[PDB]
Amino acid sequence: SKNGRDSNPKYLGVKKFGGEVVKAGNILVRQRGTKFKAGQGVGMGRDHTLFALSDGKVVFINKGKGARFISIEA
Amino acid sequence: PRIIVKMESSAGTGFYYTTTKNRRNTQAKLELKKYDPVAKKHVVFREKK
Amino acid sequence: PKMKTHKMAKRRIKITGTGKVMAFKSGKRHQNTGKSGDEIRGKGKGFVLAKAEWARMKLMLPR
RNA sequence: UCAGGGAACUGAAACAUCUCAGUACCUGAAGGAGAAGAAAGAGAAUUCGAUUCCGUUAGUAGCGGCGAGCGAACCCGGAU
RNA sequence: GAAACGAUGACUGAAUCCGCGCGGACCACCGCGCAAGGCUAAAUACUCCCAGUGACCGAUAGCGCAUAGUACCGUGAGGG
RNA sequence: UGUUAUGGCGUGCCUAUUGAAGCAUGAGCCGGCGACUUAGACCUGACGUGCGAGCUUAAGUUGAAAAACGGAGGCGGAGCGAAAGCGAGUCCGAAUAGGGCGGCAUUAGUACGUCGGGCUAGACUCGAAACCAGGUGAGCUAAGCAUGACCAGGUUGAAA
RNA sequence: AACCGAACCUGGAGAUAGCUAGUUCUCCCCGAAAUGUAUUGAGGUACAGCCUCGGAUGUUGACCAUGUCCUGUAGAGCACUCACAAGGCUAAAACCUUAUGAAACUCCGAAGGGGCACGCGUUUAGUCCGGGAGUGAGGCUGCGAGAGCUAACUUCCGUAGCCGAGAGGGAAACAACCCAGACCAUCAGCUAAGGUCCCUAAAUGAUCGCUCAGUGGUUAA
RNA sequence: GCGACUGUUUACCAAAAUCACAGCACUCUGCCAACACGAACAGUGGACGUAUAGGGUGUGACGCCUGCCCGGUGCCGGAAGGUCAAGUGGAGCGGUGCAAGCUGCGAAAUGAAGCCCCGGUGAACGGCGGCCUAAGGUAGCGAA
RNA sequence: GAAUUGGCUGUAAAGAUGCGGCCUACCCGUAGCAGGACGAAAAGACCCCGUGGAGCUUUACUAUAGUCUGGCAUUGGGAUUCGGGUUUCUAGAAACUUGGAUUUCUAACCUGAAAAAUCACUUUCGGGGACCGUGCUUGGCGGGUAGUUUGACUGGGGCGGUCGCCUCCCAAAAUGUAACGGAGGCGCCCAAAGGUCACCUCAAGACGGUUGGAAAUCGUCUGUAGAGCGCAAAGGUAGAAGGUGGCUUGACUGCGAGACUGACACGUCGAGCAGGGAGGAAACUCGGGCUUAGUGAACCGGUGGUACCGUGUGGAAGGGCCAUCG
Numbered sequence A: 001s002k003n004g005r006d007s008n009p010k011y012l013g014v015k016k017f018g019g020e021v022v023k024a025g026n027i028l029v030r031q032r033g034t035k036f037k038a039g040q041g042v043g044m045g046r047d048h049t050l051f052a053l054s055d056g057k058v059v060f061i062n063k064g065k066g067a068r069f070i071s072i073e074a
Numbered sequence B: 001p002r003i004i005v006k007m008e009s010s011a012g013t014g015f016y017y018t019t020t021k022n023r024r025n026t027q028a029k030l031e032l033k034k035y036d037p038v039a040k041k042h043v044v045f046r047e048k049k
Numbered sequence C: 001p002k003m004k005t006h007k008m009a010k011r012r013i014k015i016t017g018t019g020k021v022m023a024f025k026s027g028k029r030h031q032n033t034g035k036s037g038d039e040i041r042g043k044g045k046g047f048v049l050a051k052a053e054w055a056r057m058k059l060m061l062p063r
Numbered sequence D: 001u002c003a004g005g006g007a008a009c010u011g012a013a014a015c016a017u018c019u020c021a022g023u024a025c026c027u028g029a030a031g032g033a034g035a036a037g038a039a040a041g042a043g044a045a046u047u048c049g050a051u052u053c054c055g056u057u058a059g060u061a062g063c064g065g066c067g068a069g070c071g072a073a074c075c076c077g078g079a080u
Numbered sequence E: 001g002a003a004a005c006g007a008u009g010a011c012u013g014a015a016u017c018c019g020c021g022c023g024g025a026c027c028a029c030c031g032c033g034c035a036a037g038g039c040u041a042a043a044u045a046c047u048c049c050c051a052g053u054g055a056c057c058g059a060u061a062g063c064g065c066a067u068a069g070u071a072c073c074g075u076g077a078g079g080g
Numbered sequence F: 001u002g003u004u005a006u007g008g009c010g011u012g013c014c015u016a017u018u019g020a021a022g023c024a025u026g027a028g029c030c031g032g033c034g035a036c037u038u039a040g041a042c043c044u045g046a047c048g049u050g051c052g053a054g055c056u057u058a059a060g061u062u063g064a065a066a067a068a069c070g071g072a073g074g075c076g077g078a079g080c081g082a083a084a085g086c087g088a089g090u091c092c093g094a095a096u097a098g099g100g101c102g103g104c105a106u107u108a109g110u111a112c113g114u115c116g117g118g119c120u121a122g123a124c125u126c127g128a129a130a131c132c133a134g135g136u137g138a139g140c141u142a143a144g145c146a147u148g149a150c151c152a153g154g155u156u157g158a159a160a
Numbered sequence G: 001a002a003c004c005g006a007a008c009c010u011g012g013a014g015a016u017a018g019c020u021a022g023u024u025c026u027c028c029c030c031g032a033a034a035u036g037u038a039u040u041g042a043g044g045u046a047c048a049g050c051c052u053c054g055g056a057u058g059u060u061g062a063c064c065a066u067g068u069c070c071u072g073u074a075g076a077g078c079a080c081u082c083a084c085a086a087g088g089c090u091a092a093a094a095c096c097u098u099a100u101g102a103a104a105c106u107c108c109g110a111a112g113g114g115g116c117a118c119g120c121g122u123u124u125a126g127u128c129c130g131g132g133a134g135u136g137a138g139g140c141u142g143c144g145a146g147a148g149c150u151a152a153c154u155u156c157c158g159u160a161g162c163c164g165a166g167a168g169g170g171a172a173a174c175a176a177c178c179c180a181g182a183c184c185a186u187c188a189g190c191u192a193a194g195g196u197c198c199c200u201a202a203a204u205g206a207u208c209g210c211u212c213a214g215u216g217g218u219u220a221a
Numbered sequence H: 001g002c003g004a005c006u007g008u009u010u011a012c013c014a015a016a017a018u019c020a021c022a023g024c025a026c027u028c029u030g031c032c033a034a035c036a037c038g039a040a041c042a043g044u045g046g047a048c049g050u051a052u053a054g055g056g057u058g059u060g061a062c063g064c065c066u067g068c069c070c071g072g073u074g075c076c077g078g079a080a081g082g083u084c085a086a087g088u089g090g091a092g093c094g095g096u097g098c099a100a101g102c103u104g105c106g107a108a109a110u111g112a113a114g115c116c117c118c119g120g121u122g123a124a125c126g127g128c129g130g131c132c133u134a135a136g137g138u139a140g141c142g143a144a
Numbered sequence I: 001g002a003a004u005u006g007g008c009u010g011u012a013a014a015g016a017u018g019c020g021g022c023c024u025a026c027c028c029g030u031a032g033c034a035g036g037a038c039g040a041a042a043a044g045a046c047c048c049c050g051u052g053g054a055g056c057u058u059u060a061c062u063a064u065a066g067u068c069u070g071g072c073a074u075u076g077g078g079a080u081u082c083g084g085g086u087u088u089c090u091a092g093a094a095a096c097u098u099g100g101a102u103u104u105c106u107a108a109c110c111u112g113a114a115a116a117a118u119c120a121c122u123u124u125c126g127g128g129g130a131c132c133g134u135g136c137u138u139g140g141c142g143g144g145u146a147g148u149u150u151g152a153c154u155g156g157g158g159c160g161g162u163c164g165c166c167u168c169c170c171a172a173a174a175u176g177u178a179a180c181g182g183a184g185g186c187g188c189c190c191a192a193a194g195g196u197c198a199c200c201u202c203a204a205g206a207c208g209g210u211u212g213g214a215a216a217u218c219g220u221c222u223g224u225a226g227a228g229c230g231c232a233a234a235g236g237u238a239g240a241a242g243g244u245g246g247c248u249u250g251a252c253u254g255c256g257a258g259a260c261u262g263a264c265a266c267g268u269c270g271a272g273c274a275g276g277g278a279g280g281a282a283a284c285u286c287g288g289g290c291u292u293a294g295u296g297a298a299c300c301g302g303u304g305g306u307a308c309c310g311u312g313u314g315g316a317a318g319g320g321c322c323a324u325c326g
């Protein structure tokens, strides 16, 4: 039963951070479910990674615990 | 042997195969869909073989 | 003298261009495939990067 | 030089095909040389014109566990 | 290998100039050539031997030997 | 300069190593011999020379107290593609999304030479256990064969 | 034919040798690695990562400040899951007062850490194109953890510094500890760690106390 | 205790309980024998021998004796059926020719030995067990 | 190695004449002894390592001497029954067979005796006999022989375990991070568990209720959730991804601006463009599934298209491209 098992690192985390200029198609956070939630200007991939539609300054919205959003300001 | 299988699709007079077959568990003999070969139109795909 | 390694030629590694080494895209050869339709298509023509010096002298005369 | 026989270490980062190599070695025959030589050819121009040697073709065309690696000929320029 | 052509070991086994062989499975056309008889100098290789030469040695170098296949070792092949 | 007394200080050399005065390797001493080379019209760079949108010869011929000749051929000059092929365009494709590429930065190339690397070949020098080929050995020793030789003296007491 | 699990001699033959050993003149400049992936791989190689040389660019580098977002460790807490201490209530789960533990618990949650902008400020490295590498056995201490007996000059990761390649002073001696990074000369001066009775450079220093054990100069219940 | 016995061995650390040995047993072998050396339709050895002989294997004077298990493997027989190569066969499928013809494949049926399959065989390889396998220790011995 | 070579105790790579402190010791020999100089000798035979070797073994792999076997050749007439061939002729049979098969024959061939020992010759002669032997080929057997293979991690090796993928601690509040550390899953599923359109909202407890009564089923009230999501956990989820129906396939072809991640090679997410669909009244959403596991480069080949190559030309064999399978 000696159990030497484990699983390769998943480079999950917040990629682009607050006040970074971004581009269309940049991947802005990696997550399992929706810790951070889509928000305006921002799509969300099939694996729940949200990502930019438009270019510009980035996000910052976090009052709802379990209700936090990313966004893009032209 | 096996349950689920691979199965070729053949166009109503086209060519284009598409070989994404699913279970023999409940589709005991059924296998018809629709998608376009080389003519632009979506057409009927009998997935017999 | 100096052979070309004929494992380079009709294999991926076109030598061509401004001296840079194109190669192909690999997985899902004709080994079996269900899998996605946007990967079965995205297997056309790649091009490598930090190995080129090795690839070049495989085939420096561009066969 | 030609012929009758014909290895293995080795490389393939193991080893069978493969390579090493028709190499080493043994044997036969002959001479100052020898072999080869006068197209049922090369080859794609209805071109060429016995053989041998050198340059180049060209590491091209190809061969190959299509792996390691092996590798021509024609045209053309010379010696005769 | 789609593997032609030459090559023999075994068994078979044609045709004549409106004929025979090839042109890389094979076919037609179109081309190239006359097999199963022989000889054939020169351009090529090599260095026991001789001559000349050397950004070759000069006595632990240079051939093993400034001479020796000697002394010496071995039953020998052989080494030296 | 030579040599001394006395004070202070002071753990051979190399190699191999996390770590050597090491009680870890090597070595008695001195002399001499002794190890990154060569090759090829091979690749790829640095530096230098000649000629430059063009550069250059190979085999050879003729001359040699000397070198000229020799364009066969090699490198630039067009790219994209599996290829046929098109061609400053090309490939994928039913057109518009891309890959590579020319423009613009036209970095200018080529033949030599010296050098740094690479490849191939003993490839920095020395060191196997082993594998294969053709020979030499049964004058030692293991055996066989043919022909010869040898065994003081004493005790025991079988068949018939 | 004085070494027979396969004789001796000569030849292939300079077999092959990811293995050992050895690799010689001089000064100057820079200066590493023992990490990560893959490997019939583990003491070998390939690609990265760190060195150097040349070219291009030209502060893009470095600390430090301000602004902004990201985080669930320390601590803490019991509101979920598990464990769990004394009572009441009752057919005992549950429920109430009191009370706790947690790497795989979290109603909370720092210091720190990272990304971006700015340079509001001092510095001087950076990046890209090429030629040459070596390295891929690391070790010790403090801190943070697992494995271990809360052993080990143990082992395996993280993190800083030293040795590795670091001479000099201190620690009696002493790679790692303390101070400090050796261009060359001087029979000149100041300090650091650490010292000032004699070996042994320098107060038998000054003022308050303490210990009469050689405690100093060897653990505890 | 072991081996019956004389004898033989590790030249150079083992002389023995090792080897051989008389005796016994299985099997093979009809004579250009089996078997063995051999490039060889050569020649030899067996052997100028012929089954009371020769080869091979294992036991090991002599005495009393040598038990159970043919499933597996080996071997000897069987040889209804299954499988199986070259060859014979060439129905049919294609190219290429205007055609004649040339040409690439190519079946069914029939083709040996062998193996599957069935019997036997132990002085054939062997096996005689753990609180189903083919059977499970006959005599004799036993802390060797 | 060179030596001008003492004792204790301490340190140093951990057993010190040689480093530190302290003790002892005038210079040099001769006869003796055997504690030390990790004394000498053989670059450890144990052990581990090397993708080293060699001897041997077998039901490891692969060949092969040897040997058995079918066909053909040497190799020949005959009689006999002949599945059949051809011209023969009042379903039919004589010239004849292409053969197979017992049977039989003697000129091949083998072998033996006779003044001529191996061989050659006649043989009144003898026996075997188209078998054997031999030559090519087919298949079997073939440790007799031969060339080789026989992984790695590993608190020494072996034995046991373990080799890829996913989840959570460890992992030190960014990503990352080892251990033969601690836990647990995958090598699939789903013709609907997918697209869209529309509509419902779950556990759990309390009172009351037909056989059930701790728990079936209904009914009321509580009810950020204490459920569920195909499976492992973690995140996430109440405006749903959960539970239910209607239509249908976007479980699409041609592409891919930009980024996450990796030494590569792979891997991930993807707005938007075209052809054509699907659901919706529309806006709009569709290029599989809440997400993270359900996986294999290359080589060689099978199957379907395409008409690029195809060696004098025109084809075809063969090859390439696209799709798929192993």
Ligand SMILES: [Mg+2]
Pocket: A001, A002, A003, I161
């Ligand atoms: Mg286990």
Ligand SMILES: [Mg+2]
Pocket: C014, C016
């Ligand atoms: Mg190209």
Ligand SMILES: [Mg+2]
Pocket: none
């Ligand atoms: Mg070999």
Ligand SMILES: [Mg+2]
Pocket: D011, D012
């Ligand atoms: Mg090899």
Ligand SMILES: [Mg+2]
Pocket: none
């Ligand atoms: Mg071989």
Ligand SMILES: [Mg+2]
Pocket: none
């Ligand atoms: Mg020679």
Ligand SMILES: [Mg+2]
Pocket: none
């Ligand atoms: Mg000769």
Ligand SMILES: [Mg+2]
Pocket: none
């Ligand atoms: Mg002669």
Ligand SMILES: [Mg+2]
Pocket: none
């Ligand atoms: Mg000519």
Ligand SMILES: [Mg+2]
Pocket: none
């Ligand atoms: Mg022909």
Ligand SMILES: [Mg+2]
Pocket: E005, E006
């Ligand atoms: Mg021929």
Ligand SMILES: [Mg+2]
Pocket: E023
């Ligand atoms: Mg032709």
Ligand SMILES: [Mg+2]
Pocket: none
């Ligand atoms: Mg000289």
Ligand SMILES: [Mg+2]
Pocket: none
């Ligand atoms: Mg001499």
Ligand SMILES: [Mg+2]
Pocket: none
């Ligand atoms: Mg001398």
Ligand SMILES: [Mg+2]
Pocket: E064, E080
């Ligand atoms: Mg000599």
